[PDB]
Design a protein around this ligand. Structure first.
Ligand SMILES: *[C@@H]1O[C@H](CO[C@@H]2O[C@@H](C)[C@@H](O)[C@@H](O)[C@@H]2O)[C@@H](O[C@@H]2O[C@H](CO)[C@@H](O)[C@H](O)[C@H]2NC(C)=O)[C@H](O)[C@H]1NC(C)=O
Ligand SMILES: *[C@@H]1O[C@H](CO[C@@H]2O[C@@H](C)[C@@H](O)[C@@H](O)[C@@H]2O)[C@@H](O[C@@H]2O[C@H](CO)[C@@H](O)[C@H](O)[C@H]2NC(C)=O)[C@H](O)[C@H]1NC(C)=O
Ligand SMILES: O=S(=O)(c1ccccc1)n1ccc2c(OCCNCc3ccccc3)cccc21
Ligand SMILES: *[C@@H]1O[C@H](CO[C@@H]2O[C@@H](C)[C@@H](O)[C@@H](O)[C@@H]2O)[C@@H](O)[C@H](O)[C@H]1NC(C)=O
Ligand SMILES: CC(=O)N[C@H]1[C@H]([C@H](O)[C@H](O)CO)O[C@@](O)(C(=O)O)C[C@@H]1O
Ligand SMILES: *[C@@H]1O[C@H](CO)[C@@H](O)[C@H](O)[C@H]1NC(C)=O
Ligand SMILES: *[C@@H]1O[C@H](CO)[C@@H](O)[C@H](O)[C@H]1NC(C)=O
Ligand SMILES: *[C@@H]1O[C@H](CO)[C@@H](O)[C@H](O)[C@H]1NC(C)=O
Length: 526
């Protein structure tokens, strides 16, 4: 199957999925490769090609540091890139139903990874199941990460910041201009993403240049108001300047810094990214989104508070144990290979690691709020408190605040709490329902009966897949056929949310009420 796009013909490949067929176009270029003088710049448009472009394998992933903390361990290596790293990485993928659809709704996936890592070719982002089962079109793109995607000297077009977000935006433009040739409906495009991908989706809701490029949005475990998601212009300058010092590129002409950085091998830039922060946390967002005056016209908290965003429906949610994954990347006493019973002293040191530069009083206030136990003899008390501290502060309370503020301007919002721990999860049981492990259910991997998931997980994934697809198609994440719990709208008053689990799907209210009042209303003052 060959499709004529605006810039040339592309050839795809046929996939067998569940006794049917999906057509995949893997690795279509959507921008000029950002090499040489184009490194650190906004992505430039593609010029035509005259032959057929073979989109039959995933393209290069963008340059990035790799998680080496657990060599040989699937729980960490499943997130590492599975194609060659290259600056030549601005490519996207398209899965379409067979036979070709007539006007299919389009799902555009934006991966996470702290804005420092990630790739669209991971196994858990394979869009072929969604295309097969729901007859939607799935698109995913690679976008630049790390310093190469987010180095910033604001106002300087040699390195303006937010290049990785402009990569994503150019891919959204490509879908608007080209997806009807694949049978897609450019007027029915839903963005979905997880972690930094979800933060990205929320920033497209704020960016005037993305407003005409999509219809609706799904935010899995992230939002821009999360404390890790936006770099201040002061942090960003200190970090750009530190990178230049570390690479021998310090100059008084800021533009000459950039030209010096453009002569370094990518690996020299990657090696020094970790050190631009003096005292950072486990997996620090060294180079992330900034208020650049282009993609982001103002501090996003102000835009959110004053209703300056695309008015549409949103689907937002979080996992039960968002914080646990990060504990084994630096908190003392923690290990994926034992049950990580920690002491009060270790909990206090863990707060030092996750809240550097917070006052002694601020850290005491966290301890005060999280250590007033039901039973103080329970050995797991501090282990579980530290995970909840990290998950509530970094993910759950910001997602809930985002949903409240967004819905106050009149739109329908739906909030979920994912509490199922995958039967195959390679991480230990104390880590629970971790960050990132709803993704395989959203993409329908448990629908493949070969792949060792349980029957209950197939049913759960099937329901989630239908709810997500109904949200994208119709703005309403219901499963209408199988006597399912109806998913109520989230309103700032009642704050109803839907729990997702294999047993009983339930309507609850005011998730983490006490904890989020601490994080949202008190802790920003310290
Ligand atoms: C802003 O940057 C300075 C410089 O950071 C140092 O040099 C970089 C190239 C990199 O290698 C960093 O890891 C270095 O720390 C920071 O100043 C340092 O601050 C720490 C403690 O705050 C101190 O021990 C170092 O001696 C300082 N070094 C210098 C040269 O002043 C500074 O903390 C950074 N952050 C802020 C908010 O200013
Ligand atoms: C759980 O394990 C941690 C980490 O120890 C790891 O696993 C072991 C096989 C051992 O070889 C360690 O070196 C590994 O790093 C234990 O934390 C360590 O505890 C010792 C003594 O208490 C201390 O010297 C180390 O600094 C600790 N490592 C840290 C803080 O990273 C922890 O005690 C184990 N807990 C339980 C309940 O078994
Ligand atoms: O939300 S975060 O900003 C963040 C949250 C809390 C504290 C600090 C930073 N953040 C998330 C991922 C990430 C990153 O890569 C991830 C590499 N492993 C992925 C993984 C997921 C789940 C289990 C095990 C591994 C780099 C930098 C920041 C990151
Ligand atoms: C692009 O692909 C063309 C067709 O290749 C045919 O189908 C693919 C899936 C392979 O299995 C191949 O063995 C078949 O012949 C090629 O003819 C063409 O050379 C390719 N273009 C480039 C630039 O490599
Ligand atoms: C930078 C990079 O990954 N380049 C290319 C790889 C490798 O150079 C070789 O396979 C040797 O390892 O080969 C291709 O020709 C291919 O697989 O069709 C294209 C691909 O982009
Ligand atoms: C696809 O649907 C849109 C409305 O969502 C409509 O305007 C457009 O003409 C349709 N295109 C088709 C059916 O080819
Ligand atoms: C040095 O900075 C000036 C502005 O301060 C700029 O016009 C010039 O292009 C820079 N040098 C080079 C070699 O680009
Ligand atoms: C509804 O239930 C049937 C079995 O009664 C099942 O095969 C089907 O996949 C379910 N549909 C959804 C969308 O969950």
């Amino acid at each position: 199957i060959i499709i004529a796009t605006k810039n040339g013909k592309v050839r795809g490949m046929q996939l067998t999925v569940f006794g049917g067929t999906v057509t995949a176009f893997l690795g279509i270029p959507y921008a000029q490769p950002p090499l040489g003088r184009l490194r650190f710049k906004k992505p430039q448009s593609l010029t035509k090609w005259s032959d057929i472009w073979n989109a039959t394998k995933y393209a290069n992933s963008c340059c990035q540091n790799i998680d080496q903390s657990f060599p040989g361990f699937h729980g960490s290596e499943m997130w590492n890139p599975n194609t060659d790293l290259s600056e030549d990485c601005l490519y996207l993928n398209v899965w379409i139903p067979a036979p070709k659809p007539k006007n299919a709704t389009v799902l555009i996936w934006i991966y996470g990874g702290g804005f420092q890592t990630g790739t669209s070719s991971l196994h858990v982002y394979d869009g072929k199941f969604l295309a097969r089962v729901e007859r939607v079109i799935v698109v995913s793109m690679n976008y630049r990460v790390g310093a190469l995607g987010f180095l910033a000297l604001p106002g300087n077009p040699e390195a303006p910041g937010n290049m990785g977000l402009f990569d994503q935006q150019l891919a959204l433009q490509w879908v608007q201009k080209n997806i009807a040739a694949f049978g897609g409906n450019p007027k029915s495009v839903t963005l979905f993403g997880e972690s930094a991908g979800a933060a990205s989706v929320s920033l497209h809701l704020l960016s005037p240049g993305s407003h005409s490029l999509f219809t609706r949005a799904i935010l899995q475990s992230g939002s821009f108001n999360a404390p890790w998601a936006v770099t201040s212009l002061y942090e960003a300058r200190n970090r750009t300047l530190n990178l230049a010092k570390l690479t021998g590129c310090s100059r008084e002409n800021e533009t000459e810094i950039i030209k010096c950085l453009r002569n370094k091998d990518p690996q020299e830039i990657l090696l020094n990214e970790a050190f631009v922060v003096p005292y950072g946390t486990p997996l620090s967002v060294n180079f992330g989104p900034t208020v650049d005056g282009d993609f982001l016209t103002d501090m996003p908290d102000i835009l959110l508070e004053l209703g300056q965003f695309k008015k549409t429906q949103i689907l937002v949610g979080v996992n039960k144990d968002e914080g646990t994954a990060f504990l084994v990347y630096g908190a003392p006493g923690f290990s994926k290979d034992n049950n990580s019973i920690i002491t009060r002293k270790e909990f206090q040191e863990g707060l030092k690691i996750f809240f550097p530069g917070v006052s002694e009083f601020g850290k005491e206030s966290i301890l005060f709020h999280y250590t007033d136990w039901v039973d103080d003899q329970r050995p797991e008390n501090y282990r579980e408190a530290l995970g909840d501290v990290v998950g509530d502060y970094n993910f759950i309370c910001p997602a809930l605040e985002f949903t409240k503020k967004f819905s106050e301007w009149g739109n329908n919002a739906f909030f979920y709490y994912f509490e199922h721990r995958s039967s195959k999860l390679p991480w230990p049981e104390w880590m629970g329902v971790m960050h990132g492990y709803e993704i395989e259910f959203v993409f329908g991997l448990p629908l493949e009966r070969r792949d060792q998931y349980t029957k209950a997980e197939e049913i759960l994934s099937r329901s989630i897949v239908k709810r997500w697809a109904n949200f994208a198609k119709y703005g309403n994440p219901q499963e209408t056929q199988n006597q399912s719990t109806s998913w109520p709208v989230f309103k700032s008053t009642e704050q109803k949310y839907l729990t997702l689990n294999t047993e009983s799907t339930r309507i609850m209210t005011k998730l983490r009420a006490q904890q989020c009042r601490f994080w949202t209303s008190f802790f920003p003052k310290v």
